[PDB]
């Protein structure tokens, strides 16, 4: 109806905003990967472990290329 | 009583008025080094008509400076010495010269 369409706008705003914060830092993420990471830390996960996961998945993708 | 409010604010550095009569209005809770930047406002409604703005500025400039000498400089050795028959501009420039040069 209407309240199911306002939440999509309020989510698209914040998902543009987090991409802004991501590239003012110069994180290597893009719009697709950040939506996975944001979803993961919504449920409650140690970001210091999730960061090390990404920091070595990107470290092991280079030995294969 | 206006001149008695003027005689202790400039020579000893006292602003005692529970009812807001003197045109300098102390703001409390400025215990830090914002004593020069804050804590003294020239209230324009209680400046009497027989004082122009520049005399009302210099009386605040002396009265803050003796209080600055006591509160921040920690040097308490003061006793620091027709509108009202043209002795405003006489004594105030002397008090401005003695205190600010000692400051």
């Amino acid at each position: 109806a209407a309240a199911a369409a306002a939440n999509l706008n309020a989510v698209r705003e914040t998902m543009d905003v987090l991409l802004e914060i991501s590239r003012i830092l110069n994180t290597g993420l893009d719009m697709e990967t950040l939506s996975i990471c944001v979803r993961l830390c919504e449920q409650g996960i140690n970001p210091e472990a999730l960061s090390s996961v990404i920091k070595e998945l990107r470290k092991a993708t280079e030995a294969l290329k | 009583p206006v001149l008695s409010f003027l005689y202790r604010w400039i020579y000893d550095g006292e602003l005692e008025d529970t009812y807001h009569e003197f045109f300098v209005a102390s703001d409390p809770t400025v215990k830090t080094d914002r004593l020069w930047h804050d804590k003294y406002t020239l209230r324009k409604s209680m400046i009497p008509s027989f004082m122009t703005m520049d005399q009302s500025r210099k009386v605040l400039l002396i009265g803050k400076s003796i209080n600055f000498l006591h509160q921040v400089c920690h040097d308490q050795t003061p006793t620091t010495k027709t509108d009202l028959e043209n002795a405003f501009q006489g004594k105030i420039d002397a008090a401005y010269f003695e205190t600010s040069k000692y400051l």
Binding site: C41, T61, L64 | -
Partner: protein
């Protein structure tokens, strides 16, 4: 349940391995869960995250990027009103980082 699918989608997204029948997918996933379960960090300090956010704002006002400073403050102040927050911020902060470049995107 949703967590396992999220980690699989994370492996697919970051590592570019869209086939689960690739052995490299399962090696990346096994690593991801093993790194997840190797608890070796302190928990997130909310105050240190707030200090870092404020310092990023100070770096923007120092470099006279006024639109980016006002942006950064507006977005961090909006996001921090309704623990998990500081987790996202610390995540993005360490994730890669480290260029002062344009990023208006306003």
């Amino acid at each position: 349940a949703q967590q396992e699918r999220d980690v699989r989608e994370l492996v697919r997204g970051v590592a570019g391995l869209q086939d689960e029948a690739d052995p490299n997918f399962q090696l990346a996933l096994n690593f991801a869960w093993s790194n997840f379960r190797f608890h070796r960090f302190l928990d997130v300090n909310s105050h240190k995250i707030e200090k870092t956010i404020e310092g990023i704002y100070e770096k923007f006002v120092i470099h006279s990027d006024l639109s980016k400073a006002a942006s950064w403050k507006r977005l961090t102040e909006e996001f921090l009103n309704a623990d998990a927050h500081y987790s996202i911020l610390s995540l993005l902060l360490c994730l890669s980082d480290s260029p002062s470049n344009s990023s208006y995107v306003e």
